[PDB]
Chain A
């Protein structure tokens, strides 16, 4: 009837996968309807800068990339059950957001 979305975002692929697996395991233990863990497209932030600090020599460039991993989990559970599912140790560098879908 009422559906709630968990959004897990991180820079660390291993950390976000571990948190998503932990949330899935908790949801399965709680026996709630789960609309799968959806892997949203990974987003790459790219910045290219000159390698030199002075402008001398061959114009060599440096490319830095930062990857963003996002997962969403849809479940039918009230606020107390969702809070009990989400309350555990978590990991650093990842964040989980609660939303209510209408």
Chain B
């Protein structure tokens, strides 16, 4: 079985990212892509956008790894 990951954000997947992705104790692009059946690239782009909107906060950052968490 080969997984099918969407390359662009859908109408439902976008609002699912905007609402359901927050309040997650641990947020990473890989697990976000796992949940939403999307690509890790667009998952990271959406996570960066959420950080810009301040919905989630970035705790661990690196040139290749980004770790986010819910805003408290």
On whether A and B touch (CB less than 8 Å), the answer reads no
Which residues of A are interface residues toward B (Cβ below 8 A)? Answer: none
Which residues of B are interface residues toward A (Cβ below 8 A)? Answer: none
